[PDB]
Design an enzyme around this catalytic site. Structure first.
Site, PDB file in Angstrom:
ATOM      1  N   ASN A 153       8.451   3.865  -2.081  1.00  0.00           N
ATOM      2  CA  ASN A 153       7.768   4.699  -3.056  1.00  0.00           C
ATOM      3  C   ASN A 153       7.251   6.077  -2.611  1.00  0.00           C
ATOM      4  OD1 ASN A 153       5.635   3.523  -1.734  1.00  0.00           O
ATOM      5  ND2 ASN A 153       4.510   2.947  -3.584  1.00  0.00           N
TER       6      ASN A 153
ATOM      7  N   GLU B  58      -9.431   5.438   6.196  1.00  0.00           N
ATOM      8  CA  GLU B  58      -8.054   5.864   6.448  1.00  0.00           C
ATOM      9  C   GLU B  58      -7.975   7.195   7.188  1.00  0.00           C
ATOM     10  OE1 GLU B  58      -5.746   5.551   2.853  1.00  0.00           O
ATOM     11  OE2 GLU B  58      -6.036   3.388   2.745  1.00  0.00           O
TER      12      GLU B  58
ATOM     13  N   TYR C 181      -2.556  -1.199   7.348  1.00  0.00           N
ATOM     14  CA  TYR C 181      -2.389  -2.020   6.153  1.00  0.00           C
ATOM     15  C   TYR C 181      -2.930  -3.447   6.292  1.00  0.00           C
ATOM     16  CZ  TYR C 181       0.756   1.496   4.053  1.00  0.00           C
ATOM     17  OH  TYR C 181       1.317   2.622   3.498  1.00  0.00           O
TER      18      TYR C 181
HETATM   19  N1  LIG Z   1       4.053  -6.296  -5.220  1.00  0.00           N
HETATM   20  C1  LIG Z   1       3.536  -5.206  -4.665  1.00  0.00           C
HETATM   21  N2  LIG Z   1       2.327  -4.760  -5.058  1.00  0.00           N
HETATM   22  C2  LIG Z   1       1.781  -3.749  -4.372  1.00  0.00           C
HETATM   23  N3  LIG Z   1       2.238  -3.084  -3.312  1.00  0.00           N
HETATM   24  C3  LIG Z   1       3.510  -3.491  -3.019  1.00  0.00           C
HETATM   25  C4  LIG Z   1       4.201  -4.511  -3.638  1.00  0.00           C
HETATM   26  N4  LIG Z   1       5.475  -4.648  -3.097  1.00  0.00           N
HETATM   27  C5  LIG Z   1       5.507  -3.728  -2.165  1.00  0.00           C
HETATM   28  N5  LIG Z   1       4.365  -2.953  -2.078  1.00  0.00           N
HETATM   29  C6  LIG Z   1       4.128  -1.760  -1.221  1.00  0.00           C
HETATM   30  O1  LIG Z   1       3.006  -2.033  -0.388  1.00  0.00           O
HETATM   31  C7  LIG Z   1       2.321  -0.818  -0.258  1.00  0.00           C
HETATM   32  C8  LIG Z   1       0.838  -0.926   0.106  1.00  0.00           C
HETATM   33  O2  LIG Z   1       0.174   0.353  -0.039  1.00  0.00           O
HETATM   34  P1  LIG Z   1       0.983   1.738  -0.455  1.00  0.00           P
HETATM   35  O3  LIG Z   1      -0.054   2.544  -1.128  1.00  0.00           O
HETATM   36  O4  LIG Z   1       1.582   2.267   0.803  1.00  0.00           O
HETATM   37  O5  LIG Z   1       2.092   1.258  -1.552  1.00  0.00           O
HETATM   38  C9  LIG Z   1       2.447  -0.156  -1.604  1.00  0.00           C
HETATM   39  C10 LIG Z   1       3.848  -0.463  -1.984  1.00  0.00           C
HETATM   40  O6  LIG Z   1       4.688   0.542  -1.482  1.00  0.00           O
END
Ligand SMILES: Nc1ncnc2c1ncn2[C@@H]1O[C@@H]2COP(=O)(O)O[C@H]2[C@H]1O
Ligand SMILES: Nc1ncnc2c1ncn2[C@@H]1O[C@@H]2COP(=O)(O)O[C@H]2[C@H]1O
Ligand SMILES: Nc1ncnc2c1ncn2[C@@H]1O[C@@H]2COP(=O)(O)O[C@H]2[C@H]1O
Ligand SMILES: Nc1ncnc2c1ncn2[C@@H]1O[C@@H]2COP(=O)(O)O[C@H]2[C@H]1O
Lengths: 143, 144, 143, 144
Positions: free
Chosen positions: B113, B127, B50
């Site tokens: 999520n 990835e 990330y």
């Molecule tokens: N404000 C935000 N906007 C986007 N991603 C967020 C935010 N807060 C938390 N996240 C998390 O950060 C993650 C980054 O990639 P993911 O696709 O795993 O899904 C995202 C969310 O689960």
């Protein structure tokens, strides 16, 4: 007691597109997947894994089918897992398999019977170590 | 055309015991799992994966959650897989997620999520290479 | 008897650029490398691997050093391997290590002592399974 | 600049018990092993790796030899690593190999030539991704 057992979704299970359905059968019965890896076995791996059947007449066919395509290897953890797993899978021969079992629902024949499960706790220990490092197995709590 | 994309079932997905349900969502849509590996990510692995969000205020929490328990790493294959995957997952914020999507049915919050899916084809390539050798990915035919 | 034991080239061994020299020490003494993998251990892996030392006062430092950089994990196979390996490595404390041993030649201190070797056959079995699947270990004949 | 290239110690290298000697050849030249894994290749893995030579008359024998015993897969890192690796290995045909090279000192024939090294940077990227996840490659500093 909480035990760990090996489960293998055979090539036919992947081809039928029921990987998720099989895993859900386990999850809903309390058999927690604690290790999972999709892999294409080589002939040597299949032969060494099924060494106990080397004298049997179906050995060669079993090995060829087991390397015909990729499989999903899994370690299931749970109460009386070795026996519970085998019950859920159902009879080796789909024809004699109980209703609601994985094999009755998805297997084509005794050769293409969708899944493998360790037959005993002694064999489970061996089968698991054959395909997984202890560091590749991870328990987690259910919420 | 046929593409490959990365899918990660986050810690909350395993804790709710819905690994199978999620994989079925993909299979039923024609997104074939061609690589699967349950793994417990280390802090370095999560941070490296990330990196793009390192300048984000939620980064730190993201990493802690991503290493709080094991995850299931997967490569999905199919026609327009990258986009199809995003449709099935639904909006990143479960609240905004459409009906029938994974996040609407299983996710609890934006932080928890349930799944991650590559956002573009360029990212998918990166990835996938991050978590899988090409020899760990195997396509197969669909047939009854 | 032919035994299998675990050997780990610690972070300092890689930093000194003597991976090849260490492996040659084993090869020339008849300890055949049958599994090898460079890996960066996570804190959980290091802690679980050294569980036997969790009550010791050097535990925390050992874990931090063991995750400071990557290591080379190996399974050595040979006649009386568990003991032979430890002899070749030398005393845990480099200061007391015999001449010609890996630790006397390359170790900096007791903390950064370049290598780890299973201390017993019982521990070897556990240490090997911790880091290697049976399918990742391959014996071959010497020519 | 700093590059990464793939190196494979073929079955004959392990059988002669010279894994350490070969790795030392690289280390002493500043080519840092950042990924190492002993593995026994399957026929499919070898064929896929050497696909470019499938139309060659020696392909079949190449594959059989490459699966006849285990091999040591490695990723080497360093300044101009791809080229440096080829210099250290020497000519593909041991007979034509220069003095002090791996093939001149250890190889027996063109078929049993002890090592393989990526021939170009483009190929290195492909060969490395074939056998290693990015998370299986780890650089480290050189220091006494
Ligand atoms: N404000 C935000 N906007 C986007 N991603 C967020 C935010 N807060 C938390 N996240 C998390 O950060 C993650 C980054 O990639 P993911 O696709 O795993 O899904 C995202 C969310 O689960
Ligand atoms: N008559 C047979 N008895 C038992 N197993 C058989 C027989 N013929 C074929 N097999 C297969 O051999 C396999 C060996 O173990 P499995 O649990 O994988 O399931 C078994 C069946 O798929
Ligand atoms: N006094 C000590 N006694 C034993 N091991 C020690 C001590 N202090 C530090 N250590 C380290 O702890 C390590 C545990 O097992 P190793 O074989 O890896 O080698 C040991 C030493 O590097
Ligand atoms: N005539 C040939 N020309 C090139 N490669 C050959 C020939 N005969 C056998 N080979 C082998 O084929 C291999 C292909 O790539 P390697 O780098 O592994 O090294 C090569 C040689 O070992």
């Amino acid at each position: 007691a909480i035990e760990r057992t090996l489960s293998i979704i055979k090539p036919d299970g992947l081809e039928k597109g029921v990987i998720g359905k099989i895993i859900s059968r386990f999850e809903e019965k309390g058999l927690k997947p604690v290790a999972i890896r999709l892999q294409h076995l080589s002939q040597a791996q299949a032969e060494g894994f099924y060494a106990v059947h080397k004298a049997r007449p179906f050995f060669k066919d079993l090995v060829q089918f087991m390397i015909s395509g990729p499989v999903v290897l899994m370690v299931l953890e749970g109460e009386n897992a070795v026996l519970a797993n085998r019950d859920i899978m159902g009879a080796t021969n789909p024809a004699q398999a109980a209703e609601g079992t994985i094999r009755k629902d998805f297997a084509t024949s005794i050769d293409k019977n969708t899944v493998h499960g360790s037959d005993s706790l002694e064999n489970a220990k061996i089968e698991i170590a054959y395909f997984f490092r202890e560091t590749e197995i991870h328990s987690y709590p259910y919420q």
